[PDB]
Design a protein that fits this description.
alpha+beta, Nucleotidyltransferase, domain 5, Taq DNA Polymerase, Chain T, domain 4, 4 domains, globular, binds ligand 0L7, binds magnesium ion
DNA sequence: GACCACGGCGCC
DNA sequence: AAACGGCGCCGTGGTC
């Protein structure tokens, strides 16, 4: 390309180099733009951002987030990554996309700008005739990137002093557990080492091995294996408790307070738009989509996620979303009727599991039922949920029978989905998002059947993902008008931050927007709560 | 110091 | 672990 002085014309494709991958923490090392056979290199990157009308090109959201960080209202526009991801969700990296669609991902901003221009031209051409994918791009993915950029730049407040105090307390309990484990082992060792633990349990203590690990075939020390050995030796329970505490402390309690941004005083994640095979988002650096909530200590950690002073968090959560989606996709009368009657499958299953009336089902019991309901739906074995429920194999067989027999058209939709998948080479969501599954025609059964479970799950999980994305795009401008903030997305949950005076109105509006985003054969119901912290806002 | 595979596990 | 699906991060063991 012909070198030309900054600034570039309108509609130019940007290229840029960051000191690190996280846009909220990155230094803008270089900035460039390409248009009309010319490349414009910015002598002064930060000031040059002001000359841009939009961030158009590869990883557009990243540059936009950095711009927002610097108080510049620069929205992301066209991004070849989004086009490639829609064509094939295995297109997740700019390295891969460049190689596949015409270029090479380098470390020079000018070459990145030129690459962005070429890739877009080529990828836009491949979207010719793909009207459903084109609809997803224009109406969902492209505007969503703008929404996500604002969310990333906003961040969420965290009670740092609380977590630091909690760390000291957990450390003392960990010390008690590890000391007991070493005593019971008869000698100290690296309890964090599963290799050393394996030898202690199975060679020294002579406990029976239950399972083997996948890649190397070692005797597994997983929680599922330990759960089976809970009554064989006192050391097992102590290890399980050590596992829980060290997991939470090393993953959340200790790292998170060190990740507070010095300018915003808040915690900033990244919402990756081209990272999953189903169309779901992912969250990273740090992952805020896996904040603990199951155990007491876990809930204690979730409490650290708080609203700004004078504000309140609003948590909105779709009700039984994939089951409702399944009802629409399959068209099963029995399942549709269940949601028309306003029933709760999770509660009903949980009542059966613990053998109690459905009014005696606590949140923890209902949570466990989700493993059973979705597990069985997506192909869990009779042997597994017999171990999950600690019931005889024969009973576990019977549950799987009645589950599918209650909803006959579900199995029909699955068989239809798999056959179409074999013929076309891909499955699709309700809106036409695709996932290629070539292993549907594998001659090895274990491989073929594994692919099948991936294949028929994708339209269900993906449709729910499409619906949430659409809801986010619609909801965002409404929130901006109300002075409320969209903070987090957790797959089928949104976390908002609103002024105390407007909290209830925001909750009501967001609920209605989410419920009426795209009507199905069954009503979409959304549970909403308001609180000073994340945990309180979901109760 | 970084990167890796692995086992393991937090969430949806 | 076991024929649930979808993610990212932890420490270990290991290389470079
Ligand atoms: N396994 C430990 C127990 C907690 C859990 C969970 C799961 C959730 N999902 C998918 C299906 C849900 O529709 C979607 C949202 O998760 P959710 O809100 O927790 O569950 P749901 O929306 O069905 O219940 P609720 O929101 O009405 O309480 O994520 C799952 N999908 C699969 N294949 N397996 C799962 O375990 C889960
Ligand atoms: Mg407060
Ligand atoms: Mg939900
Ligand atoms: Mg949820
Ligand atoms: Mg792994
Ligand atoms: Mg290992």
């Amino acid at each position: 390309l012909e070198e030309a002085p900054w600034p570039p014309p309108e509609g130019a494709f940007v290229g840029f180099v960051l000191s690190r991958k996280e846009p909220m923490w990155a230094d803008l090392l270089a900035l460039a733009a390409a248009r009309g056979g010319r490349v414009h290199r910015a002598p002064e990157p930060y000031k040059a951002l002001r000359d841009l009308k939009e961030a158009r090109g590869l990883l557009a959201k990243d540059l936009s987030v950095l711009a927002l960080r610097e108080g510049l209202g620069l929205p992301p526009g066209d991004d070849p990554m989004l086009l490639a991801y829609l064509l094939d969700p295995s297109n997740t990296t700019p390295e891969g996309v460049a190689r596949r669609y015409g270029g090479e991902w380098t470390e020079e901003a000018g070459e990145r700008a030129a690459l962005s221009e070429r890739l877009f031209a080529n990828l836009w051409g491949r979207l010719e005739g793909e009207e459903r994918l084109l609809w997803l791009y224009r109406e969902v993915e492209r505007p969503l990137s703008a929404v996500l950029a604002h969310m990333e730049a906003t961040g969420v407040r965290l009670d740092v002093a609380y977590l630091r105090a909690l760390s000291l307390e957990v450390a003392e309990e960990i010390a008690r557990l590890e000391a007991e484990v070493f005593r019971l082992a008869g000698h100290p060792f690296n309890l964090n080492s599963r290799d050393q633990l394996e030898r202690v349990l199975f060679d020294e203590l002579g406990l029976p091995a239950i399972g083997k690990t996948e890649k190397t075939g070692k005797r597994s020390t997983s929680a599922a294996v330990l759960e089976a050995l809970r009554e064989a030796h006192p050391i097992v329970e102590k290890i399980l408790q050590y596992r829980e505490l060290t997991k939470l402390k090393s993953t959340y309690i200790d790292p998170l307070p060190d990740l507070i941004h010095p300018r915003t005083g808040r915690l900033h994640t990244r919402f990756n738009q081209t990272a999953t095979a189903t169309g779901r988002l992912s969250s990273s650096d740090p992952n805020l989509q896996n904040i603990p909530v199951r155990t007491p200590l876990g809930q204690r950690i979730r409490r650290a996620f708080i609203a700004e002073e004078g504000w309140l968090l609003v948590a909105l959560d779709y009700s039984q979303i994939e089951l409702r989606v399944l009802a629409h996709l399959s068209g099963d009368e029995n399942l549709i009727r269940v949601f028309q009657e306003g029933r709760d499958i999770h509660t009903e299953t949980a009542s059966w599991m613990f053998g109690v009336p459905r009014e005696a089902v606590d949140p923890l019991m209902r949570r466990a039922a989700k493993t059973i309901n979705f597990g069985v739906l997506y192909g869990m074995s009779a042997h597994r949920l017999s171990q999950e429920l600690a019931i005889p194999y024969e009973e576990a067989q019977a549950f799987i029978e009645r589950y599918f027999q209650s909803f006959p058209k579900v199995r029909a939709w699955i068989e239809k989905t798999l056959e179409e998948g074999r013929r076309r080479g891909y499955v699709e969501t309700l809106f036409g998002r695709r996932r290629y599954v070539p292993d549907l025609e594998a001659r090895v059964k274990s491989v073929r059947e594994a692919a099948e479970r991936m294949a028929f799950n994708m339209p269900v999980q993906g449709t729910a993902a499409d619906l949430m994305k659409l809801a986010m795009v619609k909801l965002f401008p409404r929130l901006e008008e109300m002075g409320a903030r969209m903070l987090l997305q957790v797959h089928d949950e949104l976390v908002l931050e609103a002024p105390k005076e407007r909290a209830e109105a925001v909750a009501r509006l967001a609920k209605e927007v989410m419920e009426g985003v795209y009507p199905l054969a069954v009503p979409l119901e959304v549970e909403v709560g308001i609180g000073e912290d994340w945990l309180s806002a979901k109760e």
